[PDB]
Ligand binder design. Sequence first.
Ligand SMILES: [Mn+2]
Ligand SMILES: [Mn+2]
Ligand SMILES: [Mn+2]
Ligand SMILES: [Mn+2]
Ligand SMILES: [Mn+2]
Ligand SMILES: [Mn+2]
Ligand SMILES: [Mn+2]
Ligand SMILES: [Mn+2]
Lengths: 282, 282
Amino acid sequence: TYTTRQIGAKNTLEYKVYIEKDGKPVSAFHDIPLYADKENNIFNMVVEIPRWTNAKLEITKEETLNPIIQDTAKGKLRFVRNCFPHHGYIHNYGAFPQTWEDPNVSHPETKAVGDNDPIDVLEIGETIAYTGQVKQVKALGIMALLDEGETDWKVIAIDINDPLAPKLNDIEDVEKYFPGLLRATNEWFRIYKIPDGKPENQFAFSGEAKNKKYALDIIKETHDSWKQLIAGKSSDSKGIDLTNVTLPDTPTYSKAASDAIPPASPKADAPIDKSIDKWFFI
Amino acid sequence: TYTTRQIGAKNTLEYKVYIEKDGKPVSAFHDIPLYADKENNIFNMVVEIPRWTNAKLEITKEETLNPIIQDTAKGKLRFVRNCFPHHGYIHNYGAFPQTWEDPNVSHPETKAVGDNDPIDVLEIGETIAYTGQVKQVKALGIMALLDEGETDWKVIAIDINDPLAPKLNDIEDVEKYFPGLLRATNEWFRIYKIPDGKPENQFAFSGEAKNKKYALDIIKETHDSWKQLIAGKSSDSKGIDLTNVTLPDTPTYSKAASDAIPPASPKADAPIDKSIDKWFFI
Ligand SMILES: [Mn+2]
Ligand SMILES: [Mn+2]
Ligand SMILES: [Mn+2]
Ligand SMILES: [Mn+2]
Ligand SMILES: [Mn+2]
Ligand SMILES: [Mn+2]
Ligand SMILES: [Mn+2]
Ligand SMILES: [Mn+2]
């Protein structure tokens, strides 16, 4: 049983969300198994941002036990802007634990280094997720996003408890039941940061969403990359905090990291500035 | 000065939003002047539904002083469904007070009876409005929607305080600063009821959004119809409660009706069933 420990009021600089393992804080990047069912390829996804929300909550690499915190830019809370016809994030967005997009290396398909973070998952179920929630999903395909020149693969997946779960098994089913969702995913990731001064993103494979096989090859590679990492054999760890509480053969393993963590102090959500409302017509 | 008096909690059955003019509840339908600045075509819009929301809030014709309550469909609280790529209402939504789409007469332009309510307005400004908000807007165009075979014009408007008001003068400027919002408005109203299992709506004029001038003509006809209604001369008033605290020359004028409304007793937003989250691919 994975739960959540909320410290602070959502939408504040102070807001932290730690994942708990049967009541004890674990590392959201390290102590949560990639696979819930390896045989079958059922993955564990850590949800960072709920669908149609704007706060840019992220699993923080350099904090101990990598809590999910809102990203900041120039001292301020970061929020993604609404770009017509979309309203915030159009997917439940998060990542697969125990994966690492090697910054030190130029993945051969996209020809650019990874973006230094857990691989990214777009979860397309019909229920809006919650922050710090662990969900079991099935990968259906993958997109090669080059986000600011950096390899940043987007894995398309679905909550296995989703009513259509059974009917979706490969990328081509995405278009049969969620027609146009895959083209909106291409357009959303090309332009979301334009209202921020960033250039427009680009996709490898001409925006081709790769199938479950290819995707599965990519999650493994990334998962192997994390293996070199938490083990201690990465060429450059970039100062990621490797503290964990469940991999005992690791240099960085450390029980008591968990007792170290402060109790939940959940507070009512802080309000978001009315500028976030703005709808951009890009 | 217009404020709002909330009773009970949002998304509940006991929720009512009353409009106040200087602290005295007044009829949201009859007592709020259609015009803010007549000769400048600046109207007072009553806001029913903030943008990107789903509870279907409406000025209630059948209740004294016509409060804004939540619509009911088959004994249950009504909520509009998410139709990709949209999220709830894509526009702040409301009506103009002192208007009436005549139920009892077949309008010559669309060939159908009126829908029995104040004319409807789509406010396209960038700020998300609030329920019961009286805002000052400027008509820009009107679309002839046939809602389940009834005359249901949609006025397209913008808050005068919008940072873009000044550049918006007639319908053609809407496609200028808001490219594609016009195409999405037509679609949104055709399909929004499909998920409820009703048929696709159709639009007169082939969905042409008619100019600001045609618009004013239609708003004005509707004001005349309301004049017959409130004066007491309607063929059939349809149980519409015509109590008012400001037109003394009207038969139903009764001050003391304002003092009869209970004090505010707002509670915080009740949770909305998770089925509401679902996104339909129509
Ligand atoms: Mn990031
Ligand atoms: Mn990420
Ligand atoms: Mn990125
Ligand atoms: Mn990334
Ligand atoms: Mn209605
Ligand atoms: Mn209406
Ligand atoms: Mn209607
Ligand atoms: Mn109507």
